[PDB]
Design a protein around this nucleic acid. Structure first.
Ligand code: FES
Ligand code: MG
Ligand code: MG
Ligand code: MG
Ligand code: MG
Ligand code: MG
Ligand code: MG
Ligand code: MG
Lengths: 86, 168, 115, 109, 295
RNA sequence: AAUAGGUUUGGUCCUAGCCUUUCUAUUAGCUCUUAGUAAGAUUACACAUGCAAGCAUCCCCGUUCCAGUGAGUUCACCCUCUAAAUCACCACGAUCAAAAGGGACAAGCAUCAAGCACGCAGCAAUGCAGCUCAAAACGCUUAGCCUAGCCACACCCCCACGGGAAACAGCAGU
């Protein structure tokens, strides 16, 4: 959400996100199904499926997104350009 | 990622996965193979895959490769007594070559187990010393015994600072 | 470290902390440091009584026999430990100290009775 | 059988014949790189006492350790010429070969 | 002439294994320990069957029954009486042979008492010293306070009999007085509370069955087996009881009447079962259920 | 360098450096109640003083050890051979371990690229002209190490007859 006022940007972004919902498949409703190593543009994301109780040992943004998704246990290393949007 | 093709070959797990440990007789192994031709394919794979593992399990056995020196690929083992062993590896697969050399010149499981037991006898549980060599450093780590003074101060009657004061 | 002369000896290398003695029975050069390098550790000895009121002694008898056969000497404390264990005859000094203690206690008893 | 030489049997390639009754041989051993975990050829130069001066530069020769070194650098002796240069006899078949082709067919006998 | 069977006999082992049963879910119940990400394999039906068979073999290895040993005879042996050393040392010495290639029951552990008596170490001292110098995972030098009566009762209230048995097996030797006492107390609590299903698919079922058979109190186990439709196990239990008590009323009745299968149970219920009427009622209820299922 | 973070710009993306966050060690500032344990000159610069090697029926043995320091530095590890030492005495051997021989063995610098005799054969006379090296020879600088401990040094001249000179890198201390 991009706006002149911060509150307007918050409202725009949060109202427009719900029209762009992904459904994230989870394994046993606590983790991802397999290790996912990908590169988006200049950012490498390497995610490891972990057993229960391992927790979210991920980048802070990834911790937030995983809490939103409903992923409890996962490891994640971000390499290359640490760009929030990428 | 890890460079090259089949980068698993450059991992300690793959190197330790070898099963061929040559007897003390074997000193040199000359691997003659051809870089082209269907019949030598297995031999090529044997050089590409199994040669590192062998050399890892046998750090002192010399291994020397030769390319396109003979029309057929073969291995020649030189033993410490002067005996030479010729293994014709044509039309065979690399797994077959590994099994054959393990059978004819590789130590069996029993010998490896005996060596491992002789190594294990070197580490005695009852020995006390540094963690590098012994499970425990001091007898104070054993429950029931008098604990370390650094953790539990000793009674004044068990410390010489007060024994000398009482005697004097 | 090559030493001039010397010989293997079975002895007690002192360990533990201050006021907490704990000996390790080891085979080592007599010229080597007391707590320094040792050829082989042959056991342990905790002089301080534990909760059960015991002084634990551990003796690798097989290796002790091997080293004595190999020519290793013995220190007096180690000889007394083995004599107490029954592995050797009681050391003459153990018996003599026992007799001296008996004489001393008898003299104390006689003095107390005379008082 | 007891010898004061470390390497008893070594297979190498002759790289020099300019010394009397001595062949300069290059012996290559696979050595693991601790970091890359890849085996590379590490080569060392040995002197082999060639009594008959039969060694030719470029042939593969097997060297046996002498019981004692006979010189400052000579510790090995030419036990066998495994692969004569340009005159390789295929050990599997016993027929002469030039590279990967038989100069004489194995079916000849 | 005619020797009564022992625990480790082939027929007894087969009967006890059959009565124990195998339950891969229970035997390989997920362990609360440091976990790792599980590995996934793609298998056909044949590969899955072979993997299940290997798991069954591993479970059978895991369920190998510990041997039942008689209580060890106390050690009272004096190797020497050196009266000269009497009163010299205020504390007794314990000498332990720590040679590596010696069985732990053949190690010489001796004690020099303050009275100068060099005596072979008692069983408790032997176990203590072996643990001190050859430590074993799961064993404690000092007896854990879990084996006190109150804590055993607390564990029993939570139905942790198998955990108690594992702790007892780790801490105590199979012939130990404490091991025997704790095992017998666990079996008695199970019999009193009818918790025979806790020890099923475990290696302690054979010991429990043997203990019940030797003391003629297999009434509750038989009742539970009948209730759970394990009539094959009940018949094998009756046969084992008859074999281990040939000169009994039940065995004589079975011999004279040539009873087999369910009748055997009836014979026992009529002859030696203290809860004979209850066993007859339960068997009649099971037979009524069988008749209803048939029709 | 990581679960990463701040920082280039009017702004964005990428690359990149720098710094922050964590854990130790030393010193400094401010402050500090007790008990136990562990550890404890910056300096291979010079040392006052006191002690640190005696024992024992005389011969012998020990003072070559322990203790110390890190100056120097691929004498440490493996194999072969075999001294001295222990097993009273031979052990017709075991253990331990010198010298000798073979192999392996730190970092930086290639603006250190040539070393200059560094090889071989012969019983010898002597003959051949070779040997090492960009897969790092030769050289310079730095550094005790691979820590149950090991190597080196013991005021300097690498050594120590000799010379310089009169020695705490033994303990306490200056
Ligand atoms: S380290 Fe054992 S008493 Fe302190
Ligand atoms: Mg310095
Ligand atoms: Mg310049
Ligand atoms: Mg220095
Ligand atoms: Mg000085
Ligand atoms: Mg000097
Ligand atoms: Mg000083
Ligand atoms: Mg000062």
């Amino acid at each position: 959400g991009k706006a002149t006022d911060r509150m307007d940007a918050f409202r725009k972004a949060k109202n427009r996100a719900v029209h762009h919902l992904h459904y994230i498949e989870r394994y046993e409703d606590h983790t991802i199904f397999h290790d996912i190593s990908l590169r988006f543009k200049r950012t490498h994301i390497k995610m490891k499926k972990q057993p229960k109780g391992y927790g979210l040992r991920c980048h802070r943004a990834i911790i937030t997104i995983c809490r939103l998704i409903g992923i409890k246990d996962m490891y994640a290393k971000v390499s290359g350009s640490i760009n929030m949007l990428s | 990622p890890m460079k090259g093709r089949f980068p698993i070959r450059r991992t300690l797990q793959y190197l330790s996965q070898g099963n061929v440990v040559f007897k003390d007789s074997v000193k040199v192994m000359t691997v003659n193979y051809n870089t082209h031709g269907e019949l030598g394919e297995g031999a090529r794979k044997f050089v590409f895959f199994n040669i590192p593992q062998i050399q890892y399990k046998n750090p002192w056995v010399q291994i020397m490769m030769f390319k396109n020196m003979t029309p057929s690929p073969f291995l020649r083992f030189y033993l410490d007594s002067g005996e030479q062993v010729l293994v014709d590896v044509e039309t065979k697969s690399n797994k077959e070559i590994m099994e054959h050399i393990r059978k004819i010149l590789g130590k069996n499981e029993e010998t490896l187990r005996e060596e491992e037991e002789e190594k294990k006898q070197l580490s005695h549980p009852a020995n006390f010393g540094p963690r590098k060599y012994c499970l425990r450093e001091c007898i104070c780590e054993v429950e029931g015994q008098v604990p370390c003074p650094s953790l539990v101060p000793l009674p004044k009657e068990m410390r010489g600072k007060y024994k000398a004061a009482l005697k004097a | 470290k090559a030493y001039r002369g010397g010989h293997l000896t079975i002895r007690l290398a002192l360990g533990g902390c201050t006021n907490r003695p704990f000996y390790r029975i080891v085979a080592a050069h007599n010229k080597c440091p007391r707590d320094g390098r040792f050829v082989e550790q042959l056991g342990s000895y905790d002089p301080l009584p534990n909760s059960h009121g015991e002084k634990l002694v551990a003796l690798n008898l097989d290796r002790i026999r091997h080293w004595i056969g190999c020519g290793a000497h013995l220190s007096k404390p180690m000889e007394k430990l083995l004599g107490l264990a029954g592995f050797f005859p009681l050391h003459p000094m153990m018996i003599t100290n026992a007799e001296r203690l008996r004489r001393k206690r008898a003299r104390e008893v006689l003095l107390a009775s005379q008082k | 059988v007891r010898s004061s030489v470390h390497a008893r049997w070594i297979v190498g390639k002759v790289i020099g014949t300019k010394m009397q009754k001595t062949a300069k041989v290059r012996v290559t051993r696979l050595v693991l790189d601790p970091y890359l975990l890849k085996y590379f050829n590490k080569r060392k130069t040995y002197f082999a006492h060639d009594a008959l001066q039969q060694c030719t530069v470029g042939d593969i020769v097997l060297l046996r350790a002498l019981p004692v070194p006979r010189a400052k650098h000579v510790k090995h002796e030419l036990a066998e010429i495994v692969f004569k240069v340009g005159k390789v006899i295929d050990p599997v078949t016993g027929k002469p070969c030039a590279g990967t082709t038989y100069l004489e067919s194995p079916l000849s006998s | 002439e005619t020797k009564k069977p022992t625990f480790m006999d082939e027929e007894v082992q087969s009967i006890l294994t059959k009565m124990t049963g195998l339950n891969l879910q229970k035997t390989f119940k997920p362990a609360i320990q440091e976990l790792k990400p599980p590995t996934y394999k793609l298998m056909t039906q044949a590969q899955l069957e072979e993997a299940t068979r290997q798991a069954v073999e591993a479970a059978k290895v895991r369920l190998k029954m510990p041997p039942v040993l008689e209580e060890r005879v106390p050690i009272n042996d004096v190797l020497a009486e050196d009266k000269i050393l009497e009163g010299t040392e205020t504390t007794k010495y314990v000498f332990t042979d720590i040679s590596y290639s010696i069985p732990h029951r053949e190690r010489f552990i001796v004690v020099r008492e303050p009275s100068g008596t060099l005596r072979k170490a008692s069983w408790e001292e032997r176990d203590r010293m072996i643990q001190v110098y050859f430590p074993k995972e799961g064993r404690k030098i000092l007896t854990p306070i879990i084996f006190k009566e109150e804590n055993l009762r607390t564990m029993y209230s939570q139905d942790r009999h198998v955990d108690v048995l594992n702790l007892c097996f780790a801490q105590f030797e199979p012939d130990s007085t404490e091991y025997i006492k704790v095992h017998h107390k666990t079996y008695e609590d199970i019999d009193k509370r009818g918790k025979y299903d806790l020890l099923r698919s475990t290696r302690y079922f054979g010991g429990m069955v043997w203990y019940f058979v030797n003391n003629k109190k297999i009434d509750g186990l038989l009742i539970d087996q009948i209730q759970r439709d394990l009539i094959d196990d009940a018949t094998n239990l009756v046969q084992l009881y008859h074999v281990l008590h040939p000169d009994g009323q039940s065995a004589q009745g079975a011999k004279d009447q040539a009873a087999e299968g369910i009748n055997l149970i009836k014979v026992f219920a009529k002859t030696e079962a203290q809860k004979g009427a209850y066993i007859e009622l339960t068997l009649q209820t099971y037979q009524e259920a069988l008749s209803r299922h048939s029709a």
